[PDB]
Design a protein around this ligand. Structure first.
Ligand SMILES: N[C@@H]1[C@@H](O)[C@H](O)[C@@H](COP(=O)(O)O)O[C@@H]1O
Length: 366
């Protein structure tokens, strides 16, 4: 129903992120630990028998997963593999010892993943956790366990609150598994703190909103962009690029920041801004140096970084300062400026934000 004070559902969806995240934390946090016993009185020796994760979705959902793979592998120490649903459903895959099947999805109707799960039944999958946002549908029903992200319905065609909430649940799950494995419990609380920080850290970004409306102008009449990201921020480059493709129709493409010099450098000029997401200092010095290599074709570096990094803008490296956040939820945090950025370009360009062209709420049908 009602958009409220908003021009577009997507806008609202972006501004709802702080609440939506509260709801995803309604009684999952309790006594400063993570409580996933909302999952059958069964549940736990299952989840403690796990020594490998296979995640499986499409689109913005693969992005979120792609992110959570970093976490798991380093926080919870549990091997993690992510794959595009379609890629999985059309190969003889080599199942892992005690693999858990997480399928991520907003609609729980995405044919390609739905199917990716149905192939897993017959393959040796320890069991099946479907993180997802629409109450009781194919992906929910057909899984052993579900974690309904509860963000209200999302009407916009590209996903915003859906994404962040999936990352929060990812983060809980990372937490629950870390302790149910024996790991020094300082780890779970870090995640938790970070997790209860998060909602008001999103409202912080949102106020730094006007500053993005500014930057959008720089990109509103471009038709190329290169998003760059390292480790957990890379999949945020993925999502950021995707959002730009999606609603501004710009051809933004994401990339391992390690890999710039192995190709796309050759592409950069005044019509293809680079954007790095949340670099550290040693990364900046590499990218800064790269971009000089192309000052003469007129290329620019745009950097979203911690205001605390003390980075300084040159004539062709432009720092866009963000507030400090906790390392552990950084990935989730740096997503909002990228969403808002896509959003403002779209607004200025005047494109159909809520239903972008040729794009679908979900691909159910074959
Ligand atoms: N337009 C949507 C997206 O916004 C989303 O990232 C993707 C996966 O859909 P789901 O999360 O419902 O599995 O597919 C659709 O194309």
């Amino acid at each position: 129903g009602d958009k409220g004070i908003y021009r577009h559902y997507m806008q609202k969806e972006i501004y709802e992120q702080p609440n939506a995240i509260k709801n995803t934390l309604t009684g999952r946090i309790s006594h400063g630990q993570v409580d996933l016993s909302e999952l059958g009185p069964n549940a736990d020796e299952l989840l403690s028998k796990v020594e490998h994760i296979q995640i499986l979705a499409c689109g913005t959902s693969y992005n979120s997963g792609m992110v959570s793979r970093y976490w798991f592998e380093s926080l919870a120490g549990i091997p993690c593999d992510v794959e595009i649903a379609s890629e999985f459903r059309y190969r003889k895959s080599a199942v892992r010892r005690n693999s858990l099947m997480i399928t991520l999805s907003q609609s729980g109707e995405t044919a390609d993943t739905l199917a990716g799960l149905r192939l897993s039944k017959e393959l040796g999958y320890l069991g099946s956790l479907a993180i997802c946002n629409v109450p009781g549908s194919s992906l929910v029903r057909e899984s052993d366990l579900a974690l309904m992200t509860n963000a209200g319905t999302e009407i916009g065609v590209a996903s915003t609150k859906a994404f962040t909430t999936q990352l929060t649940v990812l983060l809980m799950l990372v937490a629950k598994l870390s302790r149910l494995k024996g790991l020094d419990a300082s780890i779970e609380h870090d995640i938790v703190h970070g997790l209860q920080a998060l909602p008001s850290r999103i409202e912080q970004m949102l106020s730094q909103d006007k500053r993005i409306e500014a930057l959008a102008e720089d990109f509103s009449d471009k038709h190329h962009a290169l998003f760059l990201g390292r480790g957990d921020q890379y999949p945020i480059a993925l999502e950021g690029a995707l959002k730009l493709k999606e609603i501004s129709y710009i051809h933004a493409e994401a990339y391992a920041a390690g890999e710039l010099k192995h190709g796309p450098l050759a592409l950069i000029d005044a019509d293809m801004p680079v954007i790095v997401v949340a670099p550290n200092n040693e990364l900046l010095e590499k990218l800064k140096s790269n971009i000089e290599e192309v000052r003469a074709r007129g290329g620019q570096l745009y950097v979203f970084a911690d205001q605390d990094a003390g980075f300084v803008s040159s004539d062709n490296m432009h720092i866009i300062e963000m507030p400090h956040v906790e390392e552990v939820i950084a990935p989730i945090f740096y997503t909002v400026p990228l969403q808002l950025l896509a959003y403002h370009v779209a607004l200025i360009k005047g494109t159909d934000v809520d239903q972008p062209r040729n794009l679908a709420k979900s691909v159910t049908v074959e």
